[PDB]
C-alpha cells in the first residue's frame, strides 16, 4: 500500500529519474521485480514511462461522461444559458 501511494504524485512533479531513486525513495529490494510492474504499458524507464502503476494514462478527448465537457458539445454549456427558458416560462 505504501508503494501504491508515493509514486502516484511522481507523475506530474518528477520529470525524470534513474533506477537509483526507484530503489531508494520507494524502498524496493530485489531487482527486475519492477520489470514485472513494467509489463503491459511499456516502460522504457529512460525518462518517464509512468501511468501504468499508480492510476492510469491521461487518455484524450473526454466527451459525454459527467456534467460538462470541452470539445464536441456546446449544448450543455448552452444549456446553462437555456436554463432560464424554463425559469422565465
Amino acid at each position: 500500500a505504501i508503494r501504491d501511494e508515493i509514486a502516484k504524485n511522481t507523475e506530474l512533479s518528477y520529470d525524470f529519474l534513474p533506477l537509483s531513486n526507484i530503489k531508494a525513495l520507494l524502498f524496493f529490494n530485489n531487482e527486475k521485480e519492477t520489470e514485472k510492474f513494467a509489463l503491459e504499458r511499456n516502460w522504457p524507464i529512460v525518462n518517464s514511462k509512468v501511468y501504468f502503476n499508480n492510476q492510469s494514462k491521461e487518455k484524450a478527448d473526454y466527451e459525454d461522461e459527467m456534467m460538462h465537457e470541452e470539445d464536441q458539445k456546446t449544448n450543455i454549456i448552452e444549456k446553462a444559458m437555456d436554463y432560464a427558458i424554463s425559469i422565465e416560462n
Partner: protein
C-alpha cells in the same frame, strides 16, 4: 371607409343594424369623431372586413409576418453582430451605467422598514425600466456566443 346610399332614411326603409357591428357612435366619438351618429347621410353604417384564401395565407407567412428573414439564414445573425461589434461592446457598457444610475436614484427612497425619503412610485420606476435591460443582456449574451458557436471550426 366605404359608403352606402340610404336614400330616404325617415321612416320604414330597411334595417341596417343586422349584418355586422352596428349601433356604433357611443357618445360623440365615432371614427374622426366629427360624424358621431348621423355619419354622412342617414347612417350609412360603415362596416368593413377582410378575408384570405388558401394561396394568400401561405404567401404572407413565407414573405411578411413581422420582418422578412427568409431567403438567407446565417447572414442575418452575423451581419447584425458584425455591424454591432463596436456597438455591442459599447451598448453593454453604455447601458451598464444607465442601468445602475436609475437604481442609484429611485431605489434609495425605500431603505428602512419605516418611511425616510417618502417613496411612492419610485421603487416601481426602476423596476419596470430595468426589467427589459436585464432581459436584453441575456439575449445578446446568447446571440454573441451562439453565432461564433455551432461548428465553423
Amino acid at each position: 371607409d366605404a359608403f352606402r346610399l340610404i336614400d330616404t332614411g325617415a321612416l320604414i326603409n330597411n334595417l341596417e343594424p343586422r349584418q355586422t357591428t352596428s349601433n356604433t357612435g357611443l357618445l360623440n366619438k365615432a371614427n374622426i369623431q366629427a360624424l358621431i351618429h348621423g355619419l354622412n347621410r342617414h347612417y350609412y353604417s360603415l362596416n368593413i372586413d377582410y378575408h384570405k384564401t388558401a394561396k394568400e395565407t401561405k404567401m404572407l407567412m413565407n414573405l411578411h409576418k413581422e420582418q422578412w428573414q427568409s431567403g438567407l439564414k446565417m447572414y442575418d445573425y452575423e451581419e447584425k453582430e458584425e455591424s454591432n461589434l463596436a456597438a455591442t461592446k459599447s451598448m453593454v457598457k453604455i447601458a451598464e451605467q444607465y442601468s445602475k444610475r436609475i437604481e442609484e436614484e429611485k431605489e434609495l427612497t425605500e431603505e428602512e422598514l419605516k418611511t425616510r425619503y417618502v417613496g411612492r412610485q419610485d421603487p416601481k420606476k426602476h423596476l419596470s425600466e430595468t426589467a427589459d435591460e436585464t432581459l436584453e443582456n441575456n439575449i445578446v449574451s446568447v446571440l454573441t456566443a451562439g453565432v461564433n458557436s455551432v461548428a465553423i471550426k
